[PDB]
Structure 1
Amino acid sequence: VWKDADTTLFCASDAKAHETEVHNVWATHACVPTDPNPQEIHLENVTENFNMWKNNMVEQMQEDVISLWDQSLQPCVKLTGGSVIKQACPKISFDPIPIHYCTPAGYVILKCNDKNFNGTGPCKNVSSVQCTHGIKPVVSTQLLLNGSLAEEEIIIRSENLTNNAKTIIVHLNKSVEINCTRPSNGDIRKAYCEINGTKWNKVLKQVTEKLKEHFNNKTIIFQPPSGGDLEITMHSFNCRGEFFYCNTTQLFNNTCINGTITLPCKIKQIINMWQGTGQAMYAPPIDGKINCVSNITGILLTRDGGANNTSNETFRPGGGNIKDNWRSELYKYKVVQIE
């Protein structure tokens, strides 16, 4: 017997104790070795209710990631509660590694194995495990990168689709590589991302179709963000310690629904910290080719309001709350207390 409960989880990884990479260094001092031959008990005739949108596991991982950044990612100047904090801002080795989240004694992690589980409600196929799968603390907006792919069909996730204020998480079932590089040799901040239009449009089309299922076959329209912080209006992400801001206008136009889509990007030193604690300035980009090939595994969308009296539903690429990023990977997990 067991009950839904919250407890201080611990982490496990395969970090190398000799790596200068921030993630490795952190996990080396904050995590333990992974279990080479882990156990998993499949519960037959068991029905458990999940709720990705209200899961303490998310908050905890958020706290870890924040800690990892507070230790190995301090900017030159930090702007917070009216205070100005200045400190060294040396270049570092940056490349996220898988992080497993585990439960201590007396607790276990229930895992939903339903093919098309949307993150909320009852789960038919439930199993018990000590740790989750390896999850990369990849911070980004608009597009989810290097995540996990859905098993069968594309999955739409939301605490409440009827509410436009609630973020939407599109879980892709097929990856779409995005090639981002900052050429060695002008403007040391000019960058770009290449994407196979054929693949992207094919996926985006499938996304629209699935969205129709949840919106009564209403016409699905994509549009670029109305306004706000650059981190939201643009696909922001971190590549090798450098912050990339990419214009995804070409990615979200309802025309191609063929060639290589080239997105205009720029490395920003001044940024609005995702921790939501003001602004911060980092050092200039390093020299040489700055390349990062990532898998687009999910999309963060925001639905426009005031469309109830129209046959259209407008979706725009959003983001900001990194917690949603962790949800897109922890949706199938929940902690329970064993008697």
Structure 2
Amino acid sequence: VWKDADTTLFCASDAKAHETEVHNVWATHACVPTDPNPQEIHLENVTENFNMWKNNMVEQMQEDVISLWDQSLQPCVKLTGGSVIKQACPKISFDPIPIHYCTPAGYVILKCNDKNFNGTGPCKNVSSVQCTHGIKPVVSTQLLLNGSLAEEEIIIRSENLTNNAKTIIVHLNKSVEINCTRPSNGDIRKAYCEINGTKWNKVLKQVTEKLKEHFNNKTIIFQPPSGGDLEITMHSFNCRGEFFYCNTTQLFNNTCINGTITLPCKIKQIINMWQGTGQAMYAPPIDGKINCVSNITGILLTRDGGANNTSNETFRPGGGNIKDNWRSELYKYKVVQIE
């Protein structure tokens, strides 16, 4: 017998104590080693309700990642409420590692194993676990990187699809590689990303067909974002400590929906902090080749309003709430207290 409850979670990881990489350092001091033989119990005849959009596990992960970045990735100047903070901004070793979230005694984590679970409502195939799977704390907008893939069909997630103000999370069932590079040898902030156009356009066509099922077979249209902060209008992410901002106009070009697509990118020092603490200037990029190859496993979308009297629905890449990134991985888990 159990009931829905929130409690203090702890973390587990396979971090190395001898690593200078910042995720390793944080996890060494903030997490315990992983269980080599974890137990999972599949529950029979058990129906449980989940709600990925109201899940305290997400708030707790957010607190961890904020703490990690605060101790690791420090900007040269910080612009809060008018209180300017100047500090050292050393270049670091940066590469996210999987973090597991675990319940203490008296509690357990229920896991939804339904193949086409959208994140809310009843789940039929439920199991109980001690810890989540390993989740990499990848901070990004527009595209979700290095995550897990949907097991069967592409999944559309939203707290309320009818509400255009609510962010849509697209969970891909097939990853697409994105290859981003700041070449060695001169604009030190000029970079680019390479993507297989045949792979991407095929996947995007499938996303269109899935969106049709949720929007009464209306015509599905992709468009680049219309105004807003750079973090939202561009695909922003962190590669080896450096903030990349990439133009994704070529990715959301309803025309193609086959060669190599090259997105123009820029390394930015002055950014709007995802933590929500204002503007900050980080250190200039390191020398040499800066490269990150990532799997696109999800897309963050925002639907246009004002289209109720037409046969079209328009979607633009979005983001800005990093909690949605954690939701995209934590959707199938909830904490319950054992009586």
TM range (shorter): over 0.9
- Corresponding residue SS for 2:251: helix
Question: How much has 1:257 moved relative to structure 2?
Answer: 1.6
Q: Residues 5-44 of structure 1, C-alpha deviation per residue, up to 9 Å, x if partnerless?
A: 0001000000000000000000000000000000001000
Q: Residues 68-93 of structure 1, C-alpha deviation per residue, up to 9 Å, x if partnerless?
A: 01101110000001110010000000
Q: Residues 37-68 of structure 1, C-alpha deviation per residue, up to 9 Å, x if partnerless?
A: 00001000000000000000000000000000
**Match runs of 1:210-289 below 5 Å:** 210-289=210-289
Question: How much has 1:213 moved relative to structure 2?
Answer: 0.2
- How many Å separate the matches in 2 of 1:277 and 1:167? 22
> Residue 334 of structure 2 aligns with which residue?
334
Q: Residues 165-185 of structure 1, C-alpha deviation per residue, up to 9 Å, x if partnerless?
A: 000000000000000000001
Runs of 4+ in 1 over 2 A off after TM superposition: none
- How many Å separate the matches in 1 of 2:224 and 2:330? 28
- Corresponding residue SS for 1:150: coil
- Corresponding residue SS for 1:206: helix
Question: How much has 1:274 moved relative to structure 2?
Answer: 0.1
- How many Å separate the matches in 2 of 1:64 and 1:312? 41
**Match runs of 1:180-199 below 5 Å:** 180-199=180-199
- How many Å separate the matches in 1 of 2:44 and 2:298? 31
> Residue 21 of structure 1 aligns with which residue?
21
- Corresponding residue SS for 1:169: strand
- How many Å separate the matches in 1 of 2:297 and 2:177? 9
Question: TM-score, with normalisation over the residues of structure 1?
Answer: 1.00
**Match runs of 1:93-172 below 5 Å:** 93-172=93-172
Percentage identity across paired residues of the two chains: 100
> Residue 53 of structure 2 aligns with which residue?
53
Question: How much has 1:308 moved relative to structure 2?
Answer: 0.2
Q: Residues 291-331 of structure 1, C-alpha deviation per residue, up to 9 Å, x if partnerless?
A: 00000000000000000000000000000000000000000
- How many Å separate the matches in 2 of 1:301 and 1:287? 35
Q: Residues 224-270 of structure 1, C-alpha deviation per residue, up to 9 Å, x if partnerless?
A: 00011000000000000000000000000100020100000000000
- Corresponding residue SS for 1:53: coil
Give structure 1 stretches of 5+ with no counterpart: none
- How many Å separate the matches in 1 of 2:217 and 2:10? 44
> Residue 44 of structure 1 aligns with which residue?
44
- How many Å separate the matches in 2 of 1:142 and 1:319? 6
- How many Å separate the matches in 2 of 1:257 and 1:122? 34
- How many Å separate the matches in 1 of 2:324 and 2:119? 12
Question: TM-score, with normalisation over the residues of structure 2?
Answer: 1.00
Question: How much has 1:126 moved relative to structure 2?
Answer: 0.2
> Residue 309 of structure 2 aligns with which residue?
309
- How many Å separate the matches in 2 of 1:257 and 1:287? 38
- How many Å separate the matches in 1 of 2:36 and 2:245? 38
- Corresponding residue SS for 1:252: coil
> Residue 73 of structure 2 aligns with which residue?
73
Aligned residues: 339
Q: Residues 194-240 of structure 1, C-alpha deviation per residue, up to 9 Å, x if partnerless?
A: 00000000000000000000000000000000011000000000000
Question: How much has 1:112 moved relative to structure 2?
Answer: 0.1
- How many Å separate the matches in 2 of 1:98 and 1:236? 21
- How many Å separate the matches in 1 of 2:188 and 2:73? 21
Question: How much has 1:277 moved relative to structure 2?
Answer: 1.0
- How many Å separate the matches in 2 of 1:257 and 1:41? 43
> Residue 293 of structure 1 aligns with which residue?
293
- How many Å separate the matches in 2 of 1:8 and 1:304? 39
- How many Å separate the matches in 1 of 2:227 and 2:46? 46
- How many Å separate the matches in 2 of 1:138 and 1:43? 32
- Corresponding residue SS for 2:208: helix
- How many Å separate the matches in 2 of 1:83 and 1:217? 52
- Corresponding residue SS for 1:251: coil
Give structure 2 stretches of 5+ with no counterpart: none
- How many Å separate the matches in 2 of 1:143 and 1:248? 10
- Corresponding residue SS for 2:187: coil
- How many Å separate the matches in 2 of 1:283 and 1:122? 47
- Corresponding residue SS for 1:250: coil
- How many Å separate the matches in 1 of 2:52 and 2:91? 36
- How many Å separate the matches in 2 of 1:266 and 1:293? 16
- How many Å separate the matches in 2 of 1:28 and 1:172? 32
- How many Å separate the matches in 2 of 1:239 and 1:136? 14
- How many Å separate the matches in 2 of 1:77 and 1:55? 34
